[PDB]
């Protein structure tokens, strides 16, 4: 019930760009718990502290054979994305104009 999962995630679809603002990433979990959390947080080039507002209530997951949707908010220019306890670092970049 309270778990940020210790697992490895991956995007299985190209992040859409709904101009409404949101960049909808969508990932699948390779790990063990059952209904846990996404260390979903964004940031700059180091864990340069935060530059990014997540717009997902409290996104989670239930089993291994399904995908986990996400929709976040990115003010623009140069910036980064992340997912994961470090084992299996999700260092994704994102540009915007």
């Amino acid at each position: 019930s309270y778990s940020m999962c210790t697992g490895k995630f991956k995007v299985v679809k190209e992040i859409a760009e709904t101009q409404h603002g949101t960049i909808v990433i969508r990932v699948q979990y390779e790990g063990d718990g059952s209904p846990c959390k996404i260390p979903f947080e964004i940031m700059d080039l180091e864990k340069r502290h935060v530059l990014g507002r997540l717009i997902t209530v409290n996104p989670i997951v239930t089993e291994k054979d399904s995908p986990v949707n996400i929709e976040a908010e990115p003010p623009f220019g140069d910036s980064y994305i992340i997912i994961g306890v470090e084992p299996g670092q999700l260092k994704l970049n994102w540009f915007k104009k």
Partner: antibody
Amino acid sequence: EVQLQQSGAELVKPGASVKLSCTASGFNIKDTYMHWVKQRPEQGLEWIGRIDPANGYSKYDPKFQGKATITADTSSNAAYLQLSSLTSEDTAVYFCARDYEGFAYWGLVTVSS
Amino acid sequence: DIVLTQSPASLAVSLGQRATISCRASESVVRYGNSFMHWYQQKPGQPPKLLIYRASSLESGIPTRFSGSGSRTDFTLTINPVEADDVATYYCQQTNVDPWAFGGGTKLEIKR
């Protein structure tokens, strides 16, 4: 668990059609991408294309077009495909996959007289 | 158009040695920081099981025998503890550019 399952086998007169079928068992096809690879006697692999169930869009390897045309649907079943004005070389196996970032789980056609 | 080039069109390694395969791409294949590289393993009349993505991977729990390596589009993989299931043509892939292809691959052979 999750089982992408292609249809047994089939054969056809040269210059005809076929319609393979990749029946996914545990995930809603919509969820991701689905592929179609090709493989013959010794030849390694050649990518025939991918399809995104949700928005029907789909891109292929250029010279494979005129031939096949991938298509699964927004509804209740599996991801299909079919080649045309078939030759002899195309006489060979086909596979389907699903995961963007590494085909994790995947799924023989002959041209004769 | 795009390209990759699995050099060793074939090779054979002793039973206890270090095997190593190094793919290579035309002029580019980089996307979102990590490369969406992909590595596989296929055996006659059987289903090509997958084993790698982005050069930092695990999938379908392969007791770590086979791991990744490399990053601008110049690459190179490895399978140190070589064994029996080990005979197959590992194929080099790429999910960055849209005419997603695989490569020439390579045949493994052991030393009895």
